Structure formats: structure tokens, C-alpha cells
Amino acid sequence: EVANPEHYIKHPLQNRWALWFFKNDKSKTWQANLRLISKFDTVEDFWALYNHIQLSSNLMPGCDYSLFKDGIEPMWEDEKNKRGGRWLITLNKQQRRSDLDRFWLETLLCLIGESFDDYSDDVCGAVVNVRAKGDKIAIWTTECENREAVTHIGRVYKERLGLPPKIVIGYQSHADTATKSKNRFVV
Ligand SMILES: Nc1nc2c(c(=O)[nH]1)[n+](CCOc1ccc(Cl)cc1)cn2[C@@H]1O[C@H](COP(=O)(O)O)[C@@H](O)[C@H]1O
């Protein structure tokens, strides 16, 4: 005697996600600048958020977005990131105009739609940095010594983003980033 779910239920996502924002303030500690915007666990709710926030290309330089699974904080020191690393896409000044927004939207959809299939549990999140010197986008994974997981994710990422074979992307452990400056893997 009941209604048909398809007609009126929001479409759940595999995971709940947290969207964070960062504004540089020089007088403050790094960690103090990282504020949580909101969380969502449906398709409908993702788009309400995406649709009401500024596109990455219109942020002041020194601002960032990040999307992490609920319960994983967007920093190396989190339990689920500390042994991890990221696949880094360094864009140039010209690509802010032509790729920044589409690569980030693509990255958002890779996360929420679990595009990494059997390895979607190694994915922690992603970070788009808006920077005068070059914009960066990266996907964070949980364990940098899981060769098969890491490289699979890289290969799917590169392909979902449409990057040609001649553009090489690197994977670096957060441990190295935190204490040096070195690619563990390329793709
Ligand atoms: N303790 C500590 N510090 C960090 C961390 C960290 O995870 N844990 N992250 C990495 C996380 O970034 C985020 C930025 C914006 C958001 Cl929405 C979420 C994460 C950067 N930092 C600090 O930023 C500096 C410049 O960073 P980058 O050139 O990479 O921008 C970096 O050298 C370091 O001092």
C-alpha cells in the first residue's frame, strides 16, 4: 500500500563527505585557517552545495577547497592519511582558465561516485589549491605502500581527467611532503 521510492527519495551516496575551505591569514596558525563548510551524503545535496559556492577559479590566491570522507580530517596527521600520499596535478597559470574548474568537478565526482571501484576504500579525499605560482589538485589515498591500489587510482584518475599519455603525474607520500623538498609512483 506504499509510495514508490524512486519518486521522492534523495539518491544516497556510498559515503558521507565533508567540504572544507581554507583562507590564508598570516597572523594565525595554519590549522586555524581550515574551516569546515558543510557535509552531505546524497546526490541532491552535493549539487546544492556545489551550485551555491564559488568556482575554484574565482577564489583569491591562497584559498583552497577540499573534500574528505566524514571522519577523515584534511591533514597528514589524521590516522587515515599519515601513512598515505597523494596524486598531484600541477596546473600552470594558463590552465586556471581552461582546466581548474573542470578537473576539480571531475575530481569531486570521482570521490562521491566511488569511481575507483575495488580500491575506493583507499581514497581519503582531494585538495584544490589556488595559488599565484600554479594551481594544484590532488587526490589523497590512505596507504602509500599499497602499490596496486595507489597506481590503479592514479590510472583511473588520469583517465577520468582526460590527460594524454605524454603528461606524467606523480604520487608522493605525505611523510616526504611533511619533512623534505620525490615521486614514489608515476602514471
Ligand atoms: N600540519 C600540517 N600542515 C600542513 C598540512 C597538513 O596536512 N598538516 N598541509 C596539507 C593539507 O593542506 C590543505 C590545504 C587546504 C585544505 Cl582546504 C585542506 C588541506 C599543508 N600544511 C602546511 O601548509 C604549508 C603549505 O602547504 P601547501 O603548499 O601544500 O598548500 C605546508 O608546508 C605546511 O606548513
**Bridge partner residues of 172 (DSSP):** 86
CATH number (3.40.718.10, 3.30.760.10, 3.65.10.10, 3.30.70.20) of 1-187 reads 3.30.760.10
**Cα of 75 to ligand 1 centre, how many Å?**
7
Choose which residue among 21, 25, 30, 172 to substitute to test ligand 1 binding: the one with the highest number of ligand atoms within 8 A of its C-beta.
30
- Alpha-carbon distance of 45 to 41, in angstroms, equals 7
Q: Is 173 in the pocket of ligand 1 (CB under 6 A)?
A: no
The Cα–Cα gap between 141 and 119 comes to 10
Q: What b/e sequence results for 10-34 when a residue is b if at least 16 CB atoms lie within 10 Å of its CB, and e otherwise?
A: eeebebebbbbbbeeeeeeeeeebb
The CB-side HSE value for 147 (13 A sphere, CA atoms) comes to 0
Q: How many residues does the chain have?
A: 187
- Picking from 95, 125, 89, 122, the residue whose alpha carbon sits closest to that of residue 110 is 125
Burial of 120 (0-12, 13-18, 19+ CB in 10 A): middle
The helix (H) or strand (E) run that includes residue 153 is helix 147-160
Mutation test of ligand 1: which of 75, 108, 137, 172 has the most ligand atoms closer than 8 Å to its C-beta? 75
Closest CA to 83 of 144, 155, 132: 144
Q: In sequence order, which residues have a C-beta less than 8 Å from that of residue 27 and are 6 or more positions away?
A: none
User: In the chain, what's the furthest Cα-to-Cα distance?
Assistant: 65
CB atoms within 10 A of CB 48: 13
Please, which experimental method was used?
X-ray
Task: Supply the angle between the helices 43-52 and 100-112 in degrees, to the nearest 10.
Answer: 160
Structural resolution in Å:
2.6
All cell numbers assigned to 20: 572544507
